[PDB]
Amino acid sequence: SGISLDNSYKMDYPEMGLCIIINNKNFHKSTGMTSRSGTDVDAANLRETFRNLKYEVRNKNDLTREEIVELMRDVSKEDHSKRSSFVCVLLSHGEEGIIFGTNGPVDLKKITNFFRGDRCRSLTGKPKLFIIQACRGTELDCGIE
Amino acid sequence: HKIPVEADFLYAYSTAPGYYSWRNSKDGSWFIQSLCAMLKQYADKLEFMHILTRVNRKVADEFESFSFDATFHAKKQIPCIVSMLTKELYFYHH
């Protein structure tokens, strides 16, 4: 064939891939974390938006830290050979490097490590997108007119 | 050839390192509101980093906190695109 360029990810596999949405609204009382009013609007918006991009959306609500880790592990062990990409959206409380399960924190590295090129071979070379709505600390941006 | 185990990840953070992130109890979070709007408008048109740059602009320009607490009032937010991608990403093909 003619000249070929290799500058863009192959996105014409049979499936776009999974879009996992973790929507943590209600937290165990003992954590002291507030209920994240408005997060259901986000989760619905994301579901519709990624639906129209032809992702296979899975919405999960109010997962413990243990459930988050097991969900990610299980998803990373699926066969993604026929999928172009992978998307995970995390909606929760957070701190720098950390997302909260309903009962306590999860290191973000623990979640993303399941999808490393050496640990999820059917996603090697494919884009893995992590979209994170969560605090990264307590600084406030005062802005400038 | 090998590829790095951290290659081909993109982290679309709602806020800059060290900062709070803002969520409106009625409308949803500033970042997710803006992300969905920009994907709806531009996913058939723009490469993903350029979509996310429009999201940065929308969050930066169109939102400012309102609070009865002076500590939390009139505050701004910028999201933070972290890319280890090795190719351009378009959600469309052909």
Binding site: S37, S92 | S21, N24, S25
Partner: peptide, 4 residues
């Protein structure tokens, strides 16, 4: 407006 709330914080996360």
């Amino acid at each position: 407006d709330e914080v996360d």
